[PDB]
Amino acid sequence: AVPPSLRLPVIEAAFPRQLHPYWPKLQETTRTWLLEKRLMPADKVEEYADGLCYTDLMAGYYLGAPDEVLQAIADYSAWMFVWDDRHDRDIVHGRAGAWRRLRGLLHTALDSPGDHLHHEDTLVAGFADSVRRLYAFLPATWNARFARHFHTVIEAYDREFHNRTRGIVPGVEEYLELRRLTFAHWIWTDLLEPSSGCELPDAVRKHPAYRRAALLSQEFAAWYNDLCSLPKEIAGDEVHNLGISLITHHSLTLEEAIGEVRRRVEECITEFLAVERDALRFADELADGTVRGKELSGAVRANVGNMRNWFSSVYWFHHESGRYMVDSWDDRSTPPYVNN
Ligand SMILES: CC[N+](CC)(CC)Cc1ccccc1
Ligand SMILES: [Mg+2]
Ligand SMILES: [Mg+2]
Ligand SMILES: [Mg+2]
């Protein structure tokens, strides 16, 4: 089963898994999309793609999403992983010029993806493809919000570059602000809306209960990744991890830091369960008997429901994905699925 140091019985008992019915087609289609966009080598796609469970992760998250919405999300999510991989490889191989150029290309492509569908850099071209498809579901105000959020995410990745180049391990709270961006908290929160087929008015999505529930879902996911990816990231000289920040700055041992991380991870679960009642109560309040009210009520309920799904999907993803199976690699510093 799941290692005791990563065991979360509450998740296993109170957060039952869910799987989108489109998943089987999703797994094959994203794999095809990875190949035809040349984002991974053909033989690495063959050997590793399905084992990475990227599609599985998303299909256990955005339940109720239209098939084409889930597809665009999965393709984007898969791109996000290979972006993390080249971000890592640029740092290790010390390719600062290449990173800065990619950084500039991503910013530009984010606002104008159509112009970049056939850019020479395949990573850019793949990004433009998934982003443009994501822009075809909801009004431009949502597209603008997604872009504004991802612009921040890119710069967050640039901060990580400069931290790792200089060996700077961020302070605990410095990291926590940073982790909200490098994990793309608000992208995932944004994508809840096209999954339920409705852009929420600011007044609804900025409701304190919605805000708190959305945050707690992402804080759990990010910090659990830190807990589970810690072995691979130490071996890979990654410095961005709550466990690492606690060791470096609070003189915690490895054993102590792991215990501290899971406690914070567990606080997320119980805090979420509290505010989930508030968020769900808010959903009931939106249903005032009007058509518009019924729409907003249903959207919020689905979204909060998927905030909950994020817990279970992320939890099992870290135990099923080959991305974190560092023990099974010849070279622990270089993941076999990574373009080296
Ligand atoms: C690894 C990068 N990722 C996924 C693409 C987005 C920043 C975080 C993540 C890791 C593991 C599970 C869910 C999200
Ligand atoms: Mg990483
Ligand atoms: Mg990273
Ligand atoms: Mg990680």
Side-chain angles (χ1 to χ4, degrees):
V2 178
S5 52
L6 308 177
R7 244 290 187 99
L8 291 177
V10 173
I11 295 297
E12 292 173 347
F15 289 76
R17 303 188 62 162
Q18 288 179 225
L19 182 65
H20 203 284
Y22 180 75
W23 177 83
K25 177 67 168 165
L26 188 74
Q27 183 196 32
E28 181 106 21
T29 305
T30 294
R31 200 204 305 116
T32 295
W33 183 82
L34 286 178
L35 278 173
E36 288 171 18
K37 295 300 177 179
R38 305 173 85 251
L39 294 181
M40 289 183 51
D43 68 330
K44 288 203 189 305
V45 170
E46 174 79 54
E47 187 168 17
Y48 298 134
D50 292 349
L52 293 175
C53 301
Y54 294 159
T55 61
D56 308 41
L57 175 60
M58 296 304 146
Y61 184 12
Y62 295 112
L63 276 303
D67 299 336
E68 68 181 333
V69 170
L70 185 58
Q71 191 61 59
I73 286 177
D75 293 352
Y76 167 78
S77 298
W79 179 95
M80 285 283 288
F81 276 103
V82 302
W83 179 40
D84 190 88
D85 294 341
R86 191 204 275 199
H87 177 265
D88 177 72
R89 289 303 93 165
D90 275 354
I91 288 171
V92 177
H93 291 327
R95 303 187 286 247
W99 163 250
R100 170 167 38 81
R101 284 190 288 279
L102 177 66
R103 169 193 181 198
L105 289 169
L106 293 185
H107 277 290
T108 301
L110 177 58
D111 294 312
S112 177
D115 297 21
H116 296 63
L117 292 179
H118 302 273
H119 191 278
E120 44 168 324
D121 195 323
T122 56
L123 184 64
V124 174
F127 177 73
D129 182 46
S130 67
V131 168
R132 189 204 65 86
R133 284 152 62 197
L134 285 171
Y135 282 174
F137 296 130
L138 286 175
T141 40
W142 184 90
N143 294 341
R145 162 149 57 99
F146 178 90
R148 170 171 59 83
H149 282 152
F150 194 77
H151 276 301
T152 311
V153 172
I154 299 179
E155 291 309 288
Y157 266 63
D158 188 72
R159 248 122 69 212
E160 283 200 339
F161 191 97
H162 296 321
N163 286 352
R164 286 180 67 182
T165 300
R166 308 181 183 114
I168 299 179
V169 175
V172 169
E173 241 281 351
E174 176 195 344
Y175 171 79
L176 288 181
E177 300 185 22
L178 174 68
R179 187 47 160 160
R180 271 160 253 242
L181 305 175
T182 62
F183 192 81
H185 279 28
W186 316 124
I187 295 298
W188 307 126
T189 306
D190 284 339
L191 294 171
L192 291 168
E193 306 176 36
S195 291
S196 43
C198 162
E199 179 183 15
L200 301 175
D202 288 342
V204 167
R205 61 180 197 93
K206 290 179 181 175
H207 184 286
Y210 190 98
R211 225 71 144 103
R212 235 307 171 99
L215 171 67
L216 291 175
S217 175
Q218 299 302 330
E219 296 291 67
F220 166 87
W223 300 347
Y224 191 65
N225 169 264
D226 288 9
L227 191 61
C228 292
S229 63
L230 183 63
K232 111 179 163 60
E233 289 180 357
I234 290 170
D237 286 315
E238 171 64 72
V239 307
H240 305 87
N241 187 312
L242 178 59
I244 297 183
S245 280
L246 287 158
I247 295 178
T248 308
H249 307 300
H250 292 16
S251 284
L252 261 41
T253 86
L254 184 66
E255 182 226 10
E256 293 177 339
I258 295 172
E260 167 81 312
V261 168
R262 57 182 297 105
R263 275 201 303 272
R264 302 195 183 200
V265 163
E266 284 170 312
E267 282 196 18
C268 291
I269 306 177
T270 55
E271 282 180 45
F272 173 82
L273 291 161
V275 76
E276 184 186 16
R277 293 201 297 174
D278 291 321
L280 284 175
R281 182 170 44 81
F282 173 51
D284 291 334
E285 295 179 359
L286 295 168
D288 51 19
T290 65
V291 175
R292 171 60 167 176
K294 179 191 174 187
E295 183 186 24
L296 291 181
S297 182
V300 168
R301 188 182 315 277
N303 293 4
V304 172
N306 286 339
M307 293 178 187
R308 150 178 288 270
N309 288 329
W310 199 212
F311 287 82
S312 60
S313 199
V314 165
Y315 179 81
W316 295 108
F317 169 72
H318 285 82
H319 310 312
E320 289 168 358
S321 179
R323 176 168 183 86
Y324 312 106
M325 299 179 178
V326 55
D327 288 337
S328 65
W329 308 337
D330 265 22
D331 179 23
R332 290 174 63 92
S333 64
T334 309
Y337 53 84
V338 140
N339 191 308
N340 201 28

